Every structure is written in C-alpha cells, then in structure tokens.
Design a protein around this ligand. Structure first.
Ligand code: 21X
Length: 231
C-alpha cells in the first residue's frame, strides 16, 4: 500500500508525516508516502496550477494539465483510488476508512480552490470526500486526518452506551476523590458500578441511545432509583 498527496503546501505535512503512527508505519515497509507539489507540473509555471473559469466565476479554478501530469508519473492505475478533498464530497466515515484501507494505491487531491476543472473529476477522481458540513481552508488537514483513520486499519500497523468514568492516581486530589469501589478489589462490584454509570450517563447525555438499548429489568431498576435519588 502507498499513499500520495498532491498539494501546494507539502511542507504542511512535515510534522504529521515525520511523527507518531505514520512515521512508524512508513518504516515497517507497510506503506510508501509521497508529497508532490502541483507547481512542479505547471505547463508554464507563470499562469500555472489554476486559471480563470470559462463563463465567469467567483474564484480561480484548478487547471487539468498539471493534475493529469501528476497522476501520469505517480503510476496511477484503474485499481488506484483518486480521492478529491472537496467540501461537498461524501462525509468521511468508518465504513469508508475500511474500504480505503483495503486499497493498494491512494492519491489525495488536496486544494483550496473555489473550483476544480470538471475534466479532472470526470476522468481522474474515483472518490470525493469531505470532513463535514463546516468550511475548511483546504484539503491537507482532511487528507491527513483520513490517512490516520485508514492507516491504523491497515494490517500490521461499542455496546450502545457511553463509556464509564475512568480514574487513576492519585486517589485524592484537590479534594476530588476517586470512587471507593474502584479501590475495593471486588471485581463484580467494580463492573456493576461501571455499568450503572454507563446507563446513567447515557440517560442524561444521549437519551436516544437508551431508546436503542435492550434494557434489562436490572437496568430499568437502576434508572428509576437514579431518577428518584434526584428528587
Ligand atoms: N466556497 C467553496 C469552498 C471550496 C473549497 C474550500 C476548501 N475546502 C476544502 O478543500 C475541503 C476539503 S475536505 C473538506 N471538508 C469540509 N470542509 C471543507 O471546506 C473541505 C472551501 C470552500
């Protein structure tokens, strides 16, 4: 598996690529990563990478020329996945992280442009993906974030409830005391207490999850005595 980033700000990938999980995984001969710059493939390098839109338009538009040239020498194939970071792409998701982790070659087209030449989309891009309804400056951070979720899912690199509260040393800290049950060594009571907390927190902060949860008699009894202790 190999992952390529087509970007104008390749320096912006410095920390991410050289540090943490991707830095380790690259070294294990698990994936090859390349950071390629658009401007390098500009036909003229003076009116390059982008230009005015035919028929008028709000902003500048990424030109097809540099992009097809980049794909050409990146050895892109019909099995490759050419992902375009765009605001109106499909929101990224876990099922997509799996599908892409199962792919050999991935090419991210990262950009800030008000628009992308349609010929790029119709004949190169296999996938268009966003991070969500909000507005970002460009595609690099989304490309890196998607890479993170995909890479950890490459080999070799919920119960329907919110999680239970967790605590560690010290036991007492600014008057804030770890629940005693967690120090008692009674694993049945520790699990039961954790389960009660899961139920109560989900009740308070995600009641929709309680509705989708197969509540036992004990679970109902727990919620009632909680909503009665409240008064
Ligand atoms: N006015 C149109 C317009 C066009 C491009 C941009 C630059 N944005 C991106 O390249 C982007 C990539 S993935 C993603 N996910 C969520 N939001 C985003 O903005 C993005 C912003 C606004």
């Amino acid at each position: 598996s190999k992952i390529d980033y087509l970007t104008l700000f390749p320096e912006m990938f410095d920390g991410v690529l050289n540090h943490s999980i991707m830095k380790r995984a690259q070294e294990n001969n698990k994936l090859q990563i390349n950071t390629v710059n658009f401007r390098d493939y500009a036909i003229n390098k003076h009116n390059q990478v982008d230009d005015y839109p035919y028929g008028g338009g709000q902003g500048m538009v990424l030109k097809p020329e540099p992009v097809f040239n980049a794909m050409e020498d990146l050895d892109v194939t019909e099995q490759t996945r050419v992902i375009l970071m765009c605001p109106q792409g499909e929101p990224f998701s876990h099922q997509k992280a799996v599908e892409l982790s199962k792919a050999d070659h991935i090419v991210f087209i990262c950009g800030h442009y008000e628009g992308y030449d349609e010929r790029i989309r119709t004949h190169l891009v296999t996938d268009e993906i966003s991070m969500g309804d909000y507005v970002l400056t460009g595609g690099e951070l989304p490309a890196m974030t998607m890479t993170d979720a995909i890479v950890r899912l490459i080999p070799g690199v919920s119960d329907g409830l919110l999680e239970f509260p967790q605590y560690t040393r010290p036991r007492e800290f600014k008057g804030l005391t770890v629940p005693d049950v967690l120090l008692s060594g009674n694993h049945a009571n520790i699990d039961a207490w954790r389960h009660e907390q899961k139920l109560i927190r989900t009740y308070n902060k995600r009641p929709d999850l309680i509705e989708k949860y197969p509540l036992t008699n004990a679970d109902k009894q727990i919620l009632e005595r909680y909503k009665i202790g409240l008064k």
